[PDB]
């Protein structure tokens, strides 16, 4: 046993994995075994979801998060997002589950049987954290891998059946993407959009042409960047800016994953394109707008003139103006006027919600959809009692959007903490004071008094 | 083909269980590593075969 | 009689598994019978 | 539901997703066995 107690390693059991920092073989095992765990869950969770799945209920009434991801890719679904074939879901689950055994095998082998360090075994697989060129090479390999991943999505969309398009003319459907957006003005334009209301940065992406085009760009950027990093070593200015150690690199990635976590939270909360409401349920903004739509329809059927109906405050009860004048739904949902959805858009004119369209053109499928979304708003208790906090037990419902937003906020937050923990530790360790202040060389004692 | 399928899958499950306990114990046991390494090789090739068997027979039972 | 015969790591693992089972039963009971809302 | 041929494995499938959690708990059993050294 090498380095497997506190005396020899300097790390207590509860920091046990830090004993692995300079043992590239065992650390490869840890990583491969862990990748096994992720793949295991993806596979097993899918099979669990499928076994529990009732095809004629909406997915979002069934506590499903993985089947919705598969369906968005265009597998197993048809018009309106109706399930036409569960077999693609079965395949995804089984293939992940089988693959996890392989990863688990390699992980266990490297972790307990294989060479503890890889450097003496191989110059290609061995590494020194402080070897800047080797670090950028491995980074380079992984960037190429990621670029290929992004192009796999492009391949599915363009050449292997397409993607589920909630926006498809005549109703949501799986659609092949033949004209992906290549224009860098549009693609990178998203990146420079404000993250505030009515703009929403990248979260605002609202058509599959832009999504696919983005991944073409990202795929090429990642492959080019990967080649770049294999062929180069870090420049002088980068050398002087960073800490070059295993723990430092971990900290950079923790920071990055934290950022991505918060982005994913906002993506699933607001976006209804890559998170189709057919599969994930209505967004918070969507369901609130759907309520206003529902009662506008109801009261207009009863004879209300919804354009001229003045609410208790003086603002229109059903319809009012946004701060820039667009006609929008009234009541509290005034906040949600940036919402856009396939069931609502046919009522939209140049100036916002069109009163003549409202009076004459609302179709029964719009009433149904608005009623459905209003009554599946993403509100519910921790024990999955659907609805407002004062609602009685009866409906077993928490929106997948809530499950996915909350989990990813928690994860992103703790990852920011991990970033700070490890970035601060990497700095201190590099400078040589992570274990405490040298009693005979206490820096503050050589500094002038503040006063 | 349902007789072939349903038992091939049970055999897949059973072997997986044996391997799940067996592989790490073998890897970390001091003696009998020679006998272990071949059994692990055998189990792995047989595990892979059974996956493919179940995979093929799937389409004659679904 | 002799202290050490049954390793402490086994006692902890079994006792811990016992706690998980009983708590698990209590959670099952939240969804069935009295207190289930049904 | 799973395809009918696999229905007998329903109870097994119900349990699989929790297995990753067992790996975390296993780390503690292992450490207890080596006295958290």
């Amino acid at each position: 046993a090498t380095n497997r107690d506190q005396e020899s390693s300097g790390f207590a059991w509860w920091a046990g994995n830090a004993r692995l920092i300079n043992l590239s073989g065992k650390l490869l095992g840890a990583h491969v075994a862990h990748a096994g765990l992720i793949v295991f869950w993806a596979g097993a969770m899918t099979l669990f979801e499928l076994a529990h799945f009732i095809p004629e209920k909406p997915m979002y009434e069934q506590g499903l998060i993985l089947i919705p991801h598969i369906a968005t890719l265009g597998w197993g679904v048809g018009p309106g997002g109706e399930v036409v074939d569960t077999f693609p879901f079965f395949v995804v689950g089984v293939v992940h589950l089988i693959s996890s055994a392989v990863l688990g095998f390699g992980g266990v082998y490297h972790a307990i049987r294989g060479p503890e360090t890889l450097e003496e075994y191989s110059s290609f697989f061995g590494y020194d954290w402080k070897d800047k060129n080797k670090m950028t090479t491995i980074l380079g390999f992984h960037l190429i891998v990621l670029g290929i991943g992004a192009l796999l999505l492009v391949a599915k969309a363009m050449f292997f059946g397409g993607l589920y398009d909630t926006w498809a003319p005549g109703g949501g459907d799986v659609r092949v993407i033949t004209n992906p957006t290549l224009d860098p003005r549009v693609i990178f334009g998203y990146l420079l959009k404000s993250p505030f209301g009515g703009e929403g940065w990248i979260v605002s992406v609202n058509n599959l042409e832009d999504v696919v085009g983005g991944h073409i760009w990202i795929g090429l950027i990642c492959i080019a960047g990967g080649i770049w990093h294999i062929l180069t070593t870090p420049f002088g200015w980068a050398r002087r800016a960073f800490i070059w150690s295993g723990e430092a690199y971990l900290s950079y990635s923790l920071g990055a994953l934290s950022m991505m976590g918060f982005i994913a939270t906002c993506f699933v909360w607001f976006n209804n394109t890559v998170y189709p409401s057919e599969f994930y349920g209505p967004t918070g903004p969507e369901a609130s707008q759907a309520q206003a739509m529902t009662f506008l329809i109801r009261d207009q059927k009863l004879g209300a003139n919804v354009g001229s109906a003045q609410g208790p405050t003086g603002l229109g009860k059903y319809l009012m103006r946004s701060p820039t004048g667009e006609i929008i739904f009234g009541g509290e949902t005034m906040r949600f006027w940036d919402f856009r959805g396939p069931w609502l858009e046919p009522l939209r004119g140049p100036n916002g919600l069109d009163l003549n369209k409202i009076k004459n053109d609302i179709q029964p499928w719009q009433e149904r959809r608005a009623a459905e979304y209003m009554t599946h708003a993403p509100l519910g208790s921790l024990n999955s009692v659907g609805g407002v906090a004062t609602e009685i037990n009866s409906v077993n419902f928490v929106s997948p959007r809530s499950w996915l937003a909350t989990s990813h906020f928690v994860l992103a937050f703790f990852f920011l903490v991990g970033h700070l923990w490890h970035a601060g530790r990497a700095r201190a360790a590099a400078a040589g004071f992570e274990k405490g202040i040298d009693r005979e060389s206490e820096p503050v004692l050589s500094m002038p008094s503040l006063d | 083909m349902t007789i072939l399928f349903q038992l091939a899958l049970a055999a897949l499950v059973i072997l997986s269980f044996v391997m799940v306990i067996g592989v790490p114990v073998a890897y970390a046991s001091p003696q009998d590593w020679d006998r272990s390494k071949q059994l692990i090789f055998l189990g792995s090739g047989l595990w892979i075969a059974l996956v493919l068997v179940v995979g093929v027979l799937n389409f004659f039972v679904v | 009689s002799e202290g050490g015969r049954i390793p402490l790591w086994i006692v902890a693992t079994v006792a811990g598994m016992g706690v998980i089972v009983i708590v698990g039963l209590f959670f099952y009971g939240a969804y069935a019978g009295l207190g289930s809302s049904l | 539901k799973l395809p009918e041929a696999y229905a007998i494995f329903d109870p097994l499938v119900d349990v699989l997703p929790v297995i990753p959690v067992l790996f975390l708990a296993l780390a503690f059993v292992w450490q207890a066995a080596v006295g958290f050294r």
């Binding site: - | 970390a28 046991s29 | - | 929790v18 292992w30």
Partner: peptide
């Protein structure tokens, strides 16, 4: 219900069994 509790019993014991078998055989824990 009986089928589900039997599965998690075999699956549940697998981990502690690995450790136990290794401890008995003076394995590389």
């Amino acid at each position: 219900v009986i089928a589900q509790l039997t599965m998690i019993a075999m699956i549940g014991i697998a981990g502690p069994m690995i450790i136990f078998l290794l401890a008995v055989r003076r394995g590389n824990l």
